[PDB]
Amino acid sequence: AMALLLQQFKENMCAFNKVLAHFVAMCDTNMPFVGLRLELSNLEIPHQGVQVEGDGFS
Amino acid sequence: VNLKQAILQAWKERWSDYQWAINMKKFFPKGATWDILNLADALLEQAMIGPSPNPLILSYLKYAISSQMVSYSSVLTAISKFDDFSRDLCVQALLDIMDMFCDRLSCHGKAEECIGLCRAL
Amino acid sequence: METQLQSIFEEVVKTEVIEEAFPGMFMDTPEDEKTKLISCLGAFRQFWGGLSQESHEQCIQWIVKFIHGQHSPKRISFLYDCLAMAVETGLLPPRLVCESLINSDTLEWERTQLWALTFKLVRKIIGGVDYKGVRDLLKVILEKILTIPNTVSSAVVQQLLAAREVIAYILERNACLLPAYFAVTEIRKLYPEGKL
Amino acid sequence: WFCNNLIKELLKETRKEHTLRAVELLYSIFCLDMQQVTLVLLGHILPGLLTDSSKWHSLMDPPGTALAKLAVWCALSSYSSASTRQKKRHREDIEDYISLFPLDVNMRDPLNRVLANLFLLISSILGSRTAGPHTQFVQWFMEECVDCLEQSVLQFMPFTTVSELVKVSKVVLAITDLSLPLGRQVAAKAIAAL
Amino acid sequence: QYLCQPLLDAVLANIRSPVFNHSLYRTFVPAMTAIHGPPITSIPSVLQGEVARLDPKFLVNLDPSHCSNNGTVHLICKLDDKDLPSVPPLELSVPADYPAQSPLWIDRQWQYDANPFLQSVHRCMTSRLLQLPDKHSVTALLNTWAQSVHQACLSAA
Known part of the structure; x- marks a missing residue:
């Protein structure tokens, strides 16, 4: 298996480490849209990009 | 509550100009383009009290011109109402403020604002 | 060799895929315009100082076909700023750039933003050409202007008019880019007597 | 017929010098009946040249600047305000x-x-x-x-x-x-x- | 193909005759009509779609200046948000045939001077503009603008 790329995220009972849970949830709900953006662009359907929709939590 | 109290609180706790812009928005829900509330008048009054202007409230006014919070017409009227003229430093500050917007001087609004810009010139 | 320049210039203007998901969370300001221009100019300077004289022009044809192959006008203007500083610093002879810019067959008048930015750059860099090169540039610019129809759209007219300022700059008598007799000879060779 | 044919003979000139001279002469020729000539010029000739899509290749810069000059001179002189045939015919x-x-x-x-x-x-x-x-x-x-x-x-x-x-x-x-x-x-x- | 070929050879032999459909009629309509019985008993709207779906942060309006009701269109937006600071209005030039191409941001360097903060806004905005994919929308430009303002608030403090 090969590495491909790396980017570092921005900085900004304490045994939960809320930041890592937030980053994992953020990747797992956002990254499904990236493949859809690529498959829309290969069939050249014009779209506004992946946007936060109305409220913040979508 | 008053604009003088908000500017003076902005001087008391040292607020940078963008934090002043945010907190000025928060203190007043109706923007009223900030010229009904006479932002340029209050900023010039509490900037030009000393022999030299305090650079904080001048930084507030230069941000409020460069960002389009305040129209050029209200600034030119509030500049026109200063005189005194015994202090060269306040006059040089007013000429730098005029050096900001002059040669640009472009109203993009109603025609009454353009007539106001004419009278202000 | 064109593979080398390919890797260089493609690695200049790459776009980030995973951004716009978790937007702006990646810890890195992408090189703003000045640092990116300096790095690009340095890498191209390495490839150019490595390059031979006879190979001096086919790479420039590749550069201009790669710029004209772009679609984003900000990308095009960035690479034109790169070409402008590459001429201004003395690295590039300021005749090959202008000729390969205009004689590029991707430069058509329908590519109006490309038209405007191209003729803006030629207005910037035409002041250093010798006069015979200015004469040949005058001929090819007139022949490029000659392809426009009698009627075009009302929005594209100002971006189309960018060639007119190059023409007004060449035929200006006080600037003295070339003897004015050469200018009227090229014009009257292209518009003979009786032609509007 | 008169004003249209003289303007046609203007518009087939190709030199700057001859177009400016032709306009400076045609104003004085049109001073035979300036008023009626302005009505024909700004009412029939110019809207027919500006509205017809095939015609405006004749409105190129050499003759076109001269023609615009002649139209505005005619308009001003008719606004601010002469022979006996012309008096009879307008009556x-x-x-x-x-x-x-x-x-x-x-x-x-x-x-x-x-x-x-x-x-x-x-x-x-x-x-x-x-x-x-x-x-x-x-x-x-x-x-x-x-x-x-x-x-x-x-x-x-x-x-x-x-x-x-x-x-x-x-x-x-x-x-x-x-x-x-x-x-x-x-x-x-x-x-x-x- | 199989079991159907001689029909195909006849009809492909006899195309381009002007009496062709006459021949088909005469050879086929009496059989069918005996069996089957007799026959039968200003602004381009893509931009209105974008503007109608924008967040109420943005306040996009047309420029009073510039050509109107013609090919390209021109916009002066705004920004309202308690979290974000007031910023220069931003000028956009949307081409005609808007999708399949990228709109252009009319640059005004002179108003993005005269402050450090607006300079940071401008540098970060040109950076995200270089980072953008091609043929982006208007909303991509507006959202890179809002994210640029937010980064220039955070980087400053």
Whole structure:
């Protein structure tokens, strides 16, 4: 298996480490849209990009 | 509550100009383009009290011109109402403020604002 | 060799895929315009100082076909700023750039933003050409202007008019880019007597 | 027939020198009956050249600047205001200029009607798409209206032309407005927002 | 193909005759009509779609200046948000045939001077503009603008 790329995220009972849970949830709900953006662009359907929709939590 | 109290609180706790812009928005829900509330008048009054202007409230006014919070017409009227003229430093500050917007001087609004810009010139 | 320049210039203007998901969370300001221009100019300077004289022009044809192959006008203007500083610093002879810019067959008048930015750059860099090169540039610019129809759209007219300022700059008598007799000879060779 | 054929013979000139001389002569030739010639020129010849899509290749810069000059000289001299045949023939003539120019001071004087109609045409040409040589013509017409005037032919200009003329590219506002109290508002709008 | 070929050979032999459909009619309509019985008993709207779906942060309006009701269109937006500071209005030039191409941001360097903060806004905005994919929308430009303002608030403090 090969590495491909790396980017570092921005900085900004304490045994939960809320930041890592937030980053994992953020990747797992956002990254499904990236493949859809690529498959829309290969069939050249014009779209506004992946946007936060109305409220913040979508 | 008053604009003088908000500017003076902005001087008391040292607020940078963008934090002043945010907190000025928060203190007043109706923007009223900030010229009904006479932002340029209050900023010039509490900037030009000393022999030299305090650079904080001048930084507030230069941000409020460069960002389009305040129209050029209200600034030119509030500049026109200063005189005194015994202090060269306040006059040089007013000429730098005029050096900001002059040669640009472009109203993009109603025609009454353009007539106001004419009278202000 | 064109593979080398390919890797260089493609690695200049790459776009980030995973951004716009978790937007702006990646810890890195992408090189703003000045640092990116300096790095690009340095890498191209390495490839150019490595390059031979006879190979001096086919790479420039590749550069201009790669710029004209772009679609984003900000990308095009960035690479034109790169070409402008590459001429201004003395690295590039300021005749090959202008000729390969205009004689590029991707430069058509329908590519109006490309038209405007191209003729803006030629207005910037035409002041250093010798006069015979200015004469040949005058001929090819007139022949490029000659392809426009009698009627075009009302929005594209100002971006189309960018060639007119190059023409007004060449035929200006006080600037003295070339003897004015050469200018009227090229014009009257292209518009003979009786032609509007 | 007279004015149309002389303007055709203008428009097939190709030199700058001969076009300017031809216009300076044709003004004096048209001073036989200036008034009727201006009505034909600004009413029939110029709208037919500006409206026909095949015709405006004749309105290129060499003859076109000269023709715009002749039209504005004719308009001004007819506004500010002569042979016995011409007196007899205009007394003969019957026409309804209210019917000829329906239009969507007096405005029953035909020259005011022709001028209002022409300026409506000029605003419509400046506002439309498909810029060509006819747009250059109406630019030149408005520029020599500005330059030739002392201050008024431009009293009949619609106020939308004030906005549009700098959309298509100062003094061409401040002269063209005729300075009413509402006219300052359109002036100050256009001049500040250049 | 199989079991159908001689029909195909006949019809492909006899195309381009002007009496062809006459021949088909005469050879086929009496059989069918005996069996089957007789026959039968200003602004382009893509931009209105974008503007109608924008967040109420943005306040996009047309420029009073510039050509109108013609090919390209021109916009002066705004920004309202308690979290974000007031910023220069931003000028956009949307081409005609808007999708399949990228709109252009009319640059005004002179108003993005005269402050450090607006300079940071401008640098970060040109950076995200270079980072953008091609043929982006208007909303991509507006959202890179809002994210640029937010980064220039955070980087400053």
